[PDB]
Amino acid sequence: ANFVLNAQARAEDKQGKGASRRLRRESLVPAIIYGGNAEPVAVTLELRELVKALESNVFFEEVVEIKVGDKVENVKIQALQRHPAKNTPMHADFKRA
C-alpha cells in the first residue's frame, strides 16, 4: 500500500532493442514480472515514479503493488539495470511475492 507503481502492458510489438530505445526516449522503463505459479508479464513504468521509489530504502524490502489496467500484482523488486555512465535506471525485474 505504501508503494504503488502505475504500469501499462508491454505487447510483443513493444519488445526488442528498437522498441525499448523508443520507450526510453519516451521516458518510460521496460520491466518484467515473474515468479511462482504464473507466466512472466512484461510491463512499462514511469522513470519519474521509479526514481522516486528507488530514493527510499524501504522500497527494497517492502511488498509493492504494480497496477496495469485493473489487475494488481504484489511484487518485490528483484533486479535493476542502470546506465554505466549516466546511472539512469534502464530495466527492472520484479518477483511475485
Binding site: L54, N57, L80, P84
Partner: protein, 137 residues
C-alpha cells in the same frame, strides 16, 4: 608509478577503445567514488598525481582504493628516425578508460571532505568525471 612486475610480451598492438564499462562501474569497496563519464587513456603519472592529491586533501584519515591499473605498454620512436626499421621502444604504461569506469573510492571520511578531494583530483585528469555513492542496487 604502477607497472606490472612481469609481462608475457613486451609490445602490444594499438587496438581500438570502444564500448561502455559494464564491469567495474559499481561502488564495491568504499562509500563514495569518482567515475569517468568519457573515454580516454590514463597514464601511471596521472594516476599517481591524482592519488597524491586525494591523500593530501584527506590527510590520510581514511582509505583510498585505486581501481585502475596501467598494464598496456606504449612505444615511441627515438626521434630523427625514419619510418620502418621495426617497432619503437616502450616508454610508459596506460590503462584504457571507458565511460562508467570507477577510478578511485574513499572509505571512512565525511562526504564533504571526500567531494573536496575528488574535485581537486578531477583537475589532474584528461577526461570528464562524476561522483557516485553506494546504493542498494
Amino acid at each position: 608509478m604502477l607497472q606490472p612486475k612481469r609481462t608475457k610480451f613486451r609490445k602490444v598492438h594499438k587496438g581500438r577503445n570502444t564500448g561502455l564499462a559494464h564491469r567495474g562501474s559499481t561502488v564495491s569497496f568504499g562509500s563514495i567514488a569518482i567515475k569517468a563519464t568519457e573515454r580516454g587513456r590514463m597514464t601511471a603519472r596521472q594516476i599517481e598525481a591524482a592519488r597524491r592529491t586525494i591523500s593530501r586533501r584527506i590527510k590520510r584519515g581514511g582509505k583510498i582504493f585505486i581501481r585502475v591499473f596501467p598494464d598496456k605498454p606504449i612505444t615511441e620512436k627515438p626521434l630523427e628516425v625514419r619510418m620502418g626499421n621495426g617497432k619503437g621502444n616502450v616508454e610508459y604504461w596506460v590503462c584504457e578508460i571507458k565511460p562508467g569506469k570507477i577510478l578511485y573510492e574513499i572509505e571512512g571520511v565525511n562526504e564533504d571532505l571526500a567531494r573536496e578531494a575528488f574535485a581537486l583530483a578531477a583537475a589532474k585528469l584528461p577526461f570528464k568525471t562524476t561522483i557516485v555513492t553506494r546504493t542498494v542496487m
